[PDB]
Amino acid sequence: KVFGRCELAAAMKRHGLDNYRGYSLGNWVCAAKFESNFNTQATNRNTDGSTDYGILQINSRWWCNDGRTPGSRNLCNIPCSALLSSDITASVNCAKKIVSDGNGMNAWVAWRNRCKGTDVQAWIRGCRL
């Protein structure tokens, strides 16, 4: 599913991401835009052999099992395919674990480089929330 901006903001709010670990909703919407273009089916392979999955591009070395990333840890206890669903629940629940891991949203490279320190409120402007 390719979400609209406000549609995704509302879904993320319902699943408890607004101000989760102090990160306002716009941060999460911004991260999703630049990680996946709001597409739940996005995948991208990395040089280390791992793959990133879903709307928040969650990595198979640490967080989910895809059956082809040797010595990976599956910390979210989910198959990586679950992160591609039109239902974002699995992605959100795993993202909550990642953002609590010590480095906050810096775990998402696109957030660090394109969202951090910007007016992220713009990403939820106009939306009925």
Domains of the chain and any CATH numbers:
1-129 (1.10.530.10)
3-state secondary structure the chain: CECCHHHHHHHHHHCCCCCECCECHHHHHHHHHHHHCCECCCEEECCCCCEEECCCCEECCCCCECCCCCCCCCCCCCEHHHHHCCCCHHHHHHHHHHHCCCCHHHHCHHHHHHCCCCCHHHHHCCCCC
Q: Tell me the structure's resolution in angstroms, rounded to a single decimal.
A: 1.4
**Residue of 18, 48, 52, 66 marked catalytic:** 52
Catalytic, 7? Answer no
Catalytic, 35? Answer yes
- Binding site residue list for substrate: 101
Experimental method: X-ray
How far apart, in Å, are the Cα atoms of 59 and each of 24, 65, 117, 124?
A: 23, 9, 24, 26
**Residue of 35, 66, 87, 119 marked catalytic:** 35
